[PDB]
C-alpha cells in the first residue's frame, strides 16, 4: 500500500525531467495570419511548432534513465516510432473539452477549423481530436503521463530495433512502477493501468493515420522541414 523508495525516486526524476524539458523548450515562430503566402505560412506556423515538440521530446528521452545506454542506432529507431505518439499524448494535455481546441503557445488556441486551414485533412484532424478528448477524460496526472511516455519509448516492437531484448528489459521497471503507482493512488479502480495501456493501442493506430497524412503531403507539393522530414519521410 506504498511505493518503494526506488519507485518514489524513479517517478520524481521523470517528473522533474518533464518539467525541466517543458520549461527549457520555452527559450518564436512564423506567426499566424486568404492568399497563397498566408496559407503556406500557416503550414509554416504548424510545422515549426511541431519541430519544437520533437525537440522537447528528444530532450526528454535523453533524461529517461537507461535510454542513452542503448545503441545509438536503437535510440533513433525508438524516437522515430515514438515521437508522434508522445506528441498526441502531450496534445491531449492541451485539450479543452468544452470548446474542443488545443492550446500551444499560452493563450493561443487552435480549433479543428484551424488545423484545416493549415493544410491538414479531416481524416487526420478528427481522430487526433477524438483521441485528445478520450485521453483527457482518463485524467492522468504528472506521474502517470511521465511513466506512460517512458513506457512508450521503450517499446521493443518498434521498426528497426536492433536490440529488442535490452529494450523490453528497460521498459519493465517502468511498467512495474506505473502498475504500483495506480494500485496505490486509485485502489478501487482495478482497471486504470489497463485503460492506460489501452491508450498505447490507440496511439499505434494513430501513428498509421499520421503516416497517411505525411505521405498525402507529397502529391500536394508541400515539403517538411528537414528535422520533421528526417523522422517522418
Amino acid at each position: 500500500m506504498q511505493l518503494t523508495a526506488a519507485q518514489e525516486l524513479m517517478i520524481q526524476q521523470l517528473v522533474a525531467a518533464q518539467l525541466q524539458c517543458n520549461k527549457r523548450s520555452f527559450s518564436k515562430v512564423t506567426p499566424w495570419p486568404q492568399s497563397r503566402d498566408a496559407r503556406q505560412q500557416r503550414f509554416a506556423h504548424f510545422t515549426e511548432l511541431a519541430i519544437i515538440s520533437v525537440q522537447e521530446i528528444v530532450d526528454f528521452a535523453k533524461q529517461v534513465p537507461g535510454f542513452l545506454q542503448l545503441g545509438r542506432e536503437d535510440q533513433i529507431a525508438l524516437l522515430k516510432a515514438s515521437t508522434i505518439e508522445i506528441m498526441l499524448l502531450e496534445t491531449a494535455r492541451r485539450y479543452n473539452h468544452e470548446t474542443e481546441c488545443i492550446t500551444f503557445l499560452k493563450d493561443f488556441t487552435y480549433s479543428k477549423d484551424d488545423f484545416h486551414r493549415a493544410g491538414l485533412q479531416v481524416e487526420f484532424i478528427n481522430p487526433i481530436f477524438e483521441f485528445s478528448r478520450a485521453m483527457r477524460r482518463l485524467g492522468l496526472d504528472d506521474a502517470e503521463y511521465a511513466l506512460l511516455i517512458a513506457i512508450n519509448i521503450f517499446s521493443a516492437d518498434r521498426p528497426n530495433v536492433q536490440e529488442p531484448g535490452r529494450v523490453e528489459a528497460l521498459q519493465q521497471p517502468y511498467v512495474e512502477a506505473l502498475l504500483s503507482y495506480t494500485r496505490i493512488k486509485r485502489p478501487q479502480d482495478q482497471l486504470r493501468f489497463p485503460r492506460m495501456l489501452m491508450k498505447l493501442v490507440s496511439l499505434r493506430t494513430l501513428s498509421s493515420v499520421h503516416s497517411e497524412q505525411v505521405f498525402a503531403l507529397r502529391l500536394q507539393d508541400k515539403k517538411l522541414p528537414p528535422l520533421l522530414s528526417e523522422i517522418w519521410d
Binding site: I76, P226, I231
Partner: peptide, 12 residues
C-alpha cells in the same frame, strides 16, 4: 543518415 536528429542526441 538521420543527421540533425543525431545531432540533438549528442548535444551537451
Amino acid at each position: 543518415d538521420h543527421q540533425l536528429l543525431r545531432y540533438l542526441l549528442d548535444k551537451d
